[PDB]
Amino acid sequence: QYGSFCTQLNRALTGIAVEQDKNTQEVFAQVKQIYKTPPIKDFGGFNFSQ
């Protein structure tokens, strides 16, 4: 009988949970494919091994 105070917290709280998935999806998902570095890694001096 206290009302819908219970649900509003749950539904509102879940919004942040779904929000996090949308945050990461729009940060790292910037390419429509997958790229692999070439086997030989001669880059004219630069070392990317780090």
Binding site: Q20, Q30, Q33, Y35, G44, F48
Partner: protein, 50 residues
């Protein structure tokens, strides 16, 4: 893990977000920005700095 409290994992596992990071690093050194603006291209890195 207390009462009524729970935690859900991120959308992308760290083992997977590394996949996006690997692709972006692999695509940036082998195709400059060309992969972002269209298909990736073979522009070698030593001259890409130029």
């Amino acid at each position: 893990k207390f009462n009524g409290l729970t935690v859900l994992p991120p959308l992308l596992t760290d083992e997977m977000i590394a996949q996006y990071t690997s692709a972006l690093l692999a695509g940036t050194i082998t195709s400059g920005w060309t992969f972002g603006a269209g298909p990736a291209l073979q522009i070698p890195f030593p001259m890409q700095m130029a």
